[PDB]
Amino acid sequence: TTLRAFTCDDLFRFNNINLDPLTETYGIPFYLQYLAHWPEYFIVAEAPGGELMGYIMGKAEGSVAREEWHGHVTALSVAPEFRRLGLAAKLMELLEEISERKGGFFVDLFVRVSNQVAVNMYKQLGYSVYRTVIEYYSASGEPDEDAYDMRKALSRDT
């Protein structure tokens, strides 16, 4: 597995990662904003021959001097033929390290409470649970799914 930075022209290649019922595509302005502002929290993993294994977006937007400078996790996916390898643990570890090096208090996360896989992954990595946003995920006719806001405090620093 090759852990590199998610360069554009890889947006034309995550079609084994983003063709899941739980992963979204977010449009091009979203990806370009997260590549321009925060290119550190945008790791991607690439198999031996091509085959994007799975990326992790992410941002760090808060306000220091109020204990709210947190490192978000605005996406996470692994290709369904590359799962159970320890890849998502690796990417989340990299995001925690990156958001700790720049002096962050806690890592945030929004996991829709329908899938027990992701929730039992974050409860095992160390993530506690914070408030449950009601009707968070908008749609896409289908119902709206409440979202656990998970928070993991790490190495308290301004």
């Binding site: 605005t74 929004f110 829709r112 968070y136 995920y137």
Partner: peptide, 5 residues
């Protein structure tokens, strides 16, 4: 995963 908009 966040919302789209």
């Amino acid at each position: 995963m966040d919302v789209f908009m």
